[PDB]
Amino acid sequence: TSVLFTEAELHTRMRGVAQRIADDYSNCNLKPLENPLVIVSVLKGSFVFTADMVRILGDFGVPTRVEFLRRGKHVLVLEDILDTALTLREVVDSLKKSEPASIKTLVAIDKPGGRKIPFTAEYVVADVPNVFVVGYGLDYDQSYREVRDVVILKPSVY
Amino acid sequence: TSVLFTEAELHTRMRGVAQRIADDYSNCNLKPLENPLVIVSVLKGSFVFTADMVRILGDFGVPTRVEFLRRGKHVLVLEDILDTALTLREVVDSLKKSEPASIKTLVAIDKPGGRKIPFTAEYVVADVPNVFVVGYGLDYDQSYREVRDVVILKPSVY
Ligand SMILES: O=c1[nH]cnc2c1ncn2[C@@H]1O[C@H](COP(=O)(O)O)[C@@H](O)[C@H]1O
Ligand SMILES: O=c1[nH]cnc2c1ncn2[C@@H]1O[C@H](COP(=O)(O)O)[C@@H](O)[C@H]1O
Ligand SMILES: [Mg+2]
Ligand SMILES: [Mg+2]
Ligand SMILES: [Mg+2]
Ligand SMILES: [Mg+2]
After folding, report:
1. Is A24 a catalytic residue?
2. Facing A146 at nearest CB: one of B64, B140, B143
3. I want to staple B130 with a disulfide (CB 3.0 to 4.6 A). Which of A98, B24, B30, B113 is the partner?
């Protein structure tokens, strides 16, 4: 239907978030191999957002190391969209059982109007009202993930 | 150490490969939902290459649908680097057991000098001599995947 955020808008916001992550993780001072920022990507839709974000965080002095879902290290969980927050709440708690060092959440699209439980992400790229969107990893039955922009799908499509 | 291919060089080659994939898959005429090009991404290093490639293939009229590793549909397997070809050979044969429609391989970095078995990819972004490279998804012990370019690592690093 209509475009909510373009690839240029997302990358601009992700650069601003990257500068915050660079400043907030300075006293940890991340270096490759020895002390990398462990990136936990929640498949599938997060792979587009994860691929761009790690290439931007490296541009800002933050070396990263990625893991894919579905101790003593600093963990940043990345998900494409934050809606009911039921999946991210279970993932964060499951990662706290391994006892890291500092765990935070970074989402690309946050829909606060769809929460089933209270949950706040430490870093949010953009906010979206309670409407169904596709693109930038988001799908409707495994399609439209490859759209470079976050758009609202036509009702006749679904 | 030195840079072999930059992000600009890769995306330029990936646009040329995308035009070939668009022409070679015309008689299949891919449409979203009903007839999508099934993208099989081999984790982990392929996630950077997969995220860029699906956003380029959509730019060329090729809608895609992604699956991640580690019937009757057209399948294109994507891997970050092609070296011994032992993993990709086993993956292709395992996907042929599901009886698709047309299966091909697309790799970002092909090292022909490291083959343990004969294997040719249908689509290759760039060729690299038998040297250890990092960046663009490639790693040395889960680090340096976030480098925007394919570079050779300093020997003192490893
Ligand atoms: O706006 C959207 N666009 C794409 N996916 C969404 C959107 N809102 C929720 N989802 C995802 O849809 C799934 C929930 O759908 P359900 O499992 O059919 O109830 C979860 O993976 C959500 O992250
Ligand atoms: O040039 C390289 N850069 C990054 N990874 C490589 C390179 N060459 C081979 N690999 C990967 O290294 C792995 C093989 O290493 P091994 O399992 O220690 O023998 C496979 O996943 C290969 O794809
Ligand atoms: Mg999600
Ligand atoms: Mg879905
Ligand atoms: Mg590989
Ligand atoms: Mg490796």
Report:
1. no
2. B64
3. B113
